[PDB]
Nucleic acid binder design. Structure first.
Ligand SMILES: [Mg+2]
Ligand SMILES: [Mg+2]
Lengths: 131, 45, 114, 138, 111, 99, 217
RNA sequence: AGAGUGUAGCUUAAAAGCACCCAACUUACACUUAGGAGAUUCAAUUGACGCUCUGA
């Protein structure tokens, strides 16, 4: 009841939130939605790397809002000398990351570098894209 | 720590065979790749 | 004797006399027998340090032990009320089987009115 | 996790009334560890990949060790300590084995809480307990 | 002219019929509602309306208890999942503290 | 227009009779089992190591940021300021052979 | 409280060649490969080898091998660059190209009047100047080389205290993309070093604590 | 050379409960199911090895 001392013991909706810029202030800093494009030729490898990255993020108390994959680009190349075809494919997989304070980002980058797999490439940049 | 995400199995169920292909781009750098058929070498121009 | 009938919105159901509560954790597997009161009548854990000698298999063993214990106590009937995932799980199934073998029914008869 | 939390909360007392208001060595350790290791070695996992466990031995062990602990709970449940002694609990330390004769064999054993009929209990039972003086009572 | 027309519905006469402490025989309706304002607890059933009825003779009691929903009902589960790791929901319940004993042993005859 | 390459193609439907034969021994399976646990353990160890590496680094950073602040209150803010260099961060991983 | 102002830099080299796998790791890899082989559903070589072969026999009663041979020949032909340009040199501590598998770090000598300092690229920052800027300047100057030293962020890595006159030594990270070095055999004794090597060479507690924020790998 | 001490990550646990790891479901995470690994630093409440902190 309202007049009782127990009022609002059932109140739960303030415990849930049922409802982007880069804020670089002065002593407290945030990069805005960093997309980590993992480009590679093996489908498996990139995925594995992405997974690892995600896991790391989870461990480090960092949000992972989106983890989509980009389409596979069929770069059909003629091996000129006798036309020998080689239909290679490049696969891009992304892992978005929001909040990050001064000291952490560098460390994260270092970790990524340490972990980099064999024949896979990075690109860390802002969200403003068109899929 | 470069071998942590290297040991990769194909997590999909229905798929083709894959062989340890040595791919070489114009930098002069080999890469282990899973290209169609057992092509050991595929040097890129 | 009566059973608490309601609690129909809430889970789990308190309509029983005797409740089998399994507690899986890291390491060791508890398996209890309870009343409406919450009085733990008959237990079987891997922590007991007698069955810590000699996991699905472990769980099964515990269940078996409990069944014997149940018999000793004179508890022959439970309502085992698990989550769906728990029910599905192999270890739980094994435990149930063990209990059945021991001779302890996991259904429990009706109240008899009139 | 949520369920666990809820349970914990329930267990705690609170100030708003509720359901409860209206209704309710080192050496030994080392040895144990060693034993465990030995067991593991013996297994060597393969066994796990469906082993039965000897029950009688386990029972015996229980009797030796935490059987007494168990029995107190049982007694409480059955209300012996409230009725027999007006309150005030105790742990039965000495393991009592009473058995009723049925024919020549078998013997119907009296464990704590078992159903046994007056037909089987017409004659007085055999008793054993492994200890060195006492006054047995029914 | 008046664009709005229609809502001329009467009150449903819903709410608590039996307040705390009231003696209640079996089958009586304790409280009626839409959306669980109050939930059923010990010896209290539920209709199709969500109306709470007493399942034993005795005293009605109201109580703030922990809410743990059935895992098949999904919305509740989802809500629970959403919550932070120290919180518990809580909800108001209705119990019936049963008065008489289920029965007594009486002497039939001396055979 | 997001269109990924996760859909298993229509070419692989009828061509599914070439390998259904998976017939292992006891020995093989057991060996595999033995391996897996070991691998898991190794992974765990590696992750622990990684954690240690990270944590130590973090600690060092913290220490630096204490010392700096102690010895120049003007500079800590500057140090904190995230530089513009990381709009287009790029690095390829290690190859197997150099040029 | 005169705080003497010395900067520094903990320079980094990214590993070029991949690392050698452990026995267990190798085994795991093999297992994975086997599983992949098992699971998979057709190959363009396997369809055009087996079926074709079968047909040929039938015809006789009434291609792949060549391709394989060709592939083998190609493999034989294609001579690769060496993974080991480190143990074959052996005595070359001063070369950047040395350790392809591991990461690396620069390590300089400086004999002063009072002290005799075995150094990790140190600097002397000015109150008006920035720390990062100072570091950059140092990088430009003492080694005498044209470098693309990719930094990460303006925040530092590790600082260290010596007190006679209070003082400090301030370390950052920098990752070399391409370091074009002028005159290999100059008198400024510079050395490229792994983790173990770093541990070994460094006499003092000031640089012995630097190895904690180095990537161990 | 002195101070704080000393259960595996962590704890008004006393060999526990949470953290943790590999698989399989998963785009991935998450959940779930199977597995996995772990500790009283050492000698009779005292002393002697390990860290953290302050000096040289
Ligand atoms: Mg109205
Ligand atoms: Mg009206």
């Amino acid at each position: 009841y309202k007049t009782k001392p127990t009022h609002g013991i059932g109140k739960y909706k303030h415990l849930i939130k049922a409802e982007v810029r880069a804020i670089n202030l002065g002593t407290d800093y945030e990069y805005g939605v960093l997309n980590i494009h993992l480009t590679a030729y093996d489908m498996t490898l990139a995925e594995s790397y992405a997974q690892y990255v995600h896991n790391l993020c989870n461990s480090l108390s960092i949000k992972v809002e989106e983890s989509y994959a980009m389409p596979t680009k069929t770069i059909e190349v003629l091996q000129l000398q006798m036309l020998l075809d080689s239909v290679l494919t490049t696969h891009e997989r992304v892992v978005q990351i929001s909040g990050l304070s001064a000291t952490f980002a560098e460390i994260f980058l270092e970790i990524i570098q340490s972990s980099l797999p064999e024949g896979v490439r990075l690109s860390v940049k802002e969200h403003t894209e068109e899929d | 720590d470069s071998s942590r995400a290297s040991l990769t199995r194909v997590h999909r169920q229905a798929y083709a065979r894959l062989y340890p292909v040595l791919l070489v781009k114009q930098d002069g750098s080999t890469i282990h790749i899973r290209y169609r058929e057992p092509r050991r070498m595929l040097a890129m121009p | 004797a009566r059973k608490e009938r309601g609690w129909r919105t809430v889970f789990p159901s308190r309509e029983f006399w005797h409740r089998l509560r399994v507690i899986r954790t890291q390491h060791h597997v508890e398996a209890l027998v309870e009343h409406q009161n919450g009085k733990v009548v008959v237990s079987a854990s891997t922590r007991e340090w007698a069955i810590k000698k000699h996991n699905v298999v472990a769980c099964e063993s515990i269940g078996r032990v409990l069944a014997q214990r149940c018999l000793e106590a004179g508890i022959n009937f439970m309502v085992y009320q698990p989550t769906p995932w728990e029910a599905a799980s192999d270890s739980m199934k094994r435990l149930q089987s063990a209990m059945t073998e021991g001779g302890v029914v996991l259904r429990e008869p009706q109240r008899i009115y009139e | 996790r949520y369920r666990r939390r809820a349970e914990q909360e329930a267990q705690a007392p609170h100030w708003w009334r509720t359901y409860r208001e209206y209704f309710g060595r080192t050496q030994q350790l080392l040895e144990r560890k060693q034993a465990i290791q030995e067991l593991r070695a013996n297994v060597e996992e393969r066994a796990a990949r469906t082993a039965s466990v000897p029950l009688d031995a386990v029972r015996a062990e229980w009797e030796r060790t935490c059987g007494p602990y168990h029995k107190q709970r049982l007694a409480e449940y059955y209300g012996l300590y409230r009725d027999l002694f007006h309150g005030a609990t105790f742990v039965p330390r000495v393991p009592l084995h009473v058995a009723y004769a049925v024919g020549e064999d078998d013997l119907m054993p009296v464990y704590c809480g078992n159903e046994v009929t007056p037909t089987e209990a017409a004659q007085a039972p055999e008793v054993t307990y492994e200890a060195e003086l006492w006054t047995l009572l029914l | 002219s008046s664009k709005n027309l229609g809502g001329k519905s009467s009150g449903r006469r819903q709410g608590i019929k039996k307040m705390e402490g009231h003696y209640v025989h079996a089958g009586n309706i304790i409280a009626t509602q839409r959306h669980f304002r109050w939930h059923p607890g010990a010896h209290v059933g539920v209709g199709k309306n969500k109306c709470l009825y007493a399942l034993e003779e005795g005293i009605v009691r109201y109580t703030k208890e922990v809410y743990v929903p059935h895992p098949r009902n999904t919305e509740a589960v989802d809500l629970i999942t959403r919550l932070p790791k120290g919180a518990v929901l809580y909800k108001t319940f209705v119990h019936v503290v049963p008065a008489k004993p289920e029965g007594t042993f009486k002497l039939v005859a001396m055979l | 227009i997001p269109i990924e390459d996760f859909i298993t193609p229509l070419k692989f439907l009828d061509k599914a009779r070439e390998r259904p034969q998976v017939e292992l021994t006891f020995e093989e399976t057991e060996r595999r089992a033995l391996l897996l646990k070991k691998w898991s353990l190794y992974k765990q160890q590696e992750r622990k190591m990684e954690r240690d590496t990270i944590r130590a680094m973090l600690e060092a950073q913290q220490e630096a940021l204490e010392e700096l602040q102690l010895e120049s209150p003007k500079l800590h803010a500057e140090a904190i300021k995230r530089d513009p260099n990381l709009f287009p961060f790029e690095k390829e991983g290690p190859h197997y052979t150099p040029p | 409280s005169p705080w003497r102002l010395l900067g520094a830099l903990c320079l980094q080299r990214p590993p070029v060649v991949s690392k050698p796998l452990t026995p267990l790791q190798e085994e795991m890899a093999s297992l994975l490969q086997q599983i992949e082989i098992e699971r998979s559903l057709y190959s363009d070589h396997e369809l055009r080898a087996l079926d074709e072969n079968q047909r040929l026999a039938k015809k006789k009663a009434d291609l792949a091998q060549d391709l394989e041979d060709m592939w083998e020949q190609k493999f034989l032909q294609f001579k690769l660059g060496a993974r080991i340009t480190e143990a074959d040199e052996k005595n070359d501590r001063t070369s950047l190209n040395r350790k392809l598998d591991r990461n690396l770090v620069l390590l300089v000598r400086e004999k002063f009047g009072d002290q005799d300092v075995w150094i990790l690229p140190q600097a002397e920052w000015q109150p008006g100047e920035t720390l990062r800027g100072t570091a950059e300047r140092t990088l430009a100057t003492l080694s005498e080389n044209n470098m693309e030293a990719k930094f990460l962020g303006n925040a530092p890595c590790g600082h260290y205290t010596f007190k006679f006159l209070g003082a400090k030594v301030f370390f950052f990270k920098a990752l070399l993309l391409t370091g074009d070095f002028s005159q290999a055999g100059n008198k400024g004794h510079h050395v490229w070093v792994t983790k173990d090597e770093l541990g070994d060479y460094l006499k003092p507690k000031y640089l012995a604590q630097v190895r904690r924020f180095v990537s161990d790998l």
